[PDB]
């Protein structure tokens, strides 16, 4: 009925353009069969479907492929990413909310919603009256919105009591000074 | 494989029947662009990036032609083995905390998509919505399947119900992921 092919090229960067590992996969439906790995510097077959192509690619364009690790990868990074993806900054929005309606000694749950930031690097911490809550905190995995922004929700198990001040602390590369959002009984 | 960054410059997907192809550039799991094959145009997700860089859509067409060439050449070499359908997985969540009257966006994440052909739509109060809808291309996964996202801009209100309708050969009946302002 349906048949597909896939060509997935990957420029793996590490510490800038230092440990660049250029790879290139060849897929049929949902199965890889051929590959160019910068680490092995040569083509190799992953499954039977690849034997028939091995030697052919190495003879036809290996000099061209190795070449791209610098004319594509390294170049793109230092020439196109540096001023776009690596520069892009989106400050997170931090809001605090309570799962249940307010009360004076009923156990509820504070939720610190940290949204729309980029890059993914972020640090969120809960504080009660000034000290780091290290008991009933939990959080969602980092969520990728698919639009070049991330979000994360950090929950705190607690019980509202007058005079108490809870603070959500957040540090991000987009921020000159951390963000703190308070919530009070 | 570990790394500080990952760039996929020229992902090609070519399917048949239909001569259905996609050409994308990804960086750190987000989509830089896809090339509109019919319009021969590189469509950037973040318009402002096109001010500081570019890509000749010609590149896409060429590489897609190769996808055409390799499919079939590979289809026979495999004795016409058909693609096994997968059942998608949808999850709905808002971009930011919901506040009555404040424009927001519902995100429908659809994972384990295979093959890369699918129908994602939105229903408001159970009636069809076309306006304020946007969706991404098919992103590659590790198991070589795909994921895609659909976006619905909307105004939160007390009495409102939304569903994300997904249709795939892998599903016997169209999955509906429902959502409402809790």
């Amino acid at each position: 009925r349906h048949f597909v092919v896939q060509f997935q090229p990957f420029c793996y960067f590490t510490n800038g353009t230092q440990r660049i590992r250029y790879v290139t996969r060849y897929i049929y439906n949902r199965e890889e069969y051929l590959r160019f790995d910068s680490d092995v510097g040569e083509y190799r077959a992953v499954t039977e479907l690849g034997r028939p192509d091995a030697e052919y690619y190495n003879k036809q364009y290996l000099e061209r492929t190795r070449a791209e690790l610098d004319t594509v990868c390294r170049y793109n990074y230092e020439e196109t990413e540096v001023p776009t993806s690596l520069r892009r900054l989106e400050q997170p929005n931090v809001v605090i909310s309570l799962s249940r309606t307010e009360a004076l000694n009923h156990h509820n749950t504070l939720v610190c919603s940290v949204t729309d930031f980029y890059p993914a690097k972020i640090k969120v911490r809960w504080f009660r009256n000034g000290q780091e809550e290290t008991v009933g905190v939990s959080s969602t995995q980092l969520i990728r919105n698919g639009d070049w922004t991330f979000q994360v929700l950090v929950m705190l198990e607690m019980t509202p009591r007058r005079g108490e001040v809870y603070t959500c602390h957040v540090e991000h590369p987009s921020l000159k000074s951390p963000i703190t959002v308070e919530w009070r009984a | 494989i570990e790394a500080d960054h990952v760039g996929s410059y020229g992902i090609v997907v070519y399917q048949s029947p239909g001569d259905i192809g996609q050409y994308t550039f990804e960086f750190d799991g987000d989509e830089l662009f896809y090339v509109d094959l019919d319009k021969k145009e590189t469509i950037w997700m973040l318009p402002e990036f096109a001010q500081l860089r570019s890509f000749d859509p010609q590149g896409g067409l060429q590489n897609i032609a190769t996808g055409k060439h390799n499919l079939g050449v590979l289809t026979k070499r495999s004795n016409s083995t058909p693609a096994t359908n997968e059942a998608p997985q949808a999850t709905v969540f808002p971009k930011s905390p919901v506040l009555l009257g404040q424009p927001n966006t519902l995100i429908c994440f659809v994972d384990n998509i295979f093959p890369p052909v699918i129908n994602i739509t939105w229903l408001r109060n159970s009636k069809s919505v076309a306006d304020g809808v946007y969706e991404t291309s098919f992103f590659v996964n590790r198991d070589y399947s795909f994921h895609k996202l659909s976006y619905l801009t909307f105004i939160p209100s007390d009495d409102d119900i939304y569903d994300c309708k997904v249709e795939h050969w892998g599903l016997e009946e169209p999955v509906l992921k429902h959502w409402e302002p809790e």
Binding site: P52, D53, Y57 | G10, D56, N63, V73
Partner: peptide, 12 residues
């Protein structure tokens, strides 16, 4: 300036 794509190589 102009980004570069990773040539998708055609088999036999």
């Amino acid at each position: 300036s102009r980004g570069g794509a990773s040539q998708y190589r055609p088999s036999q």
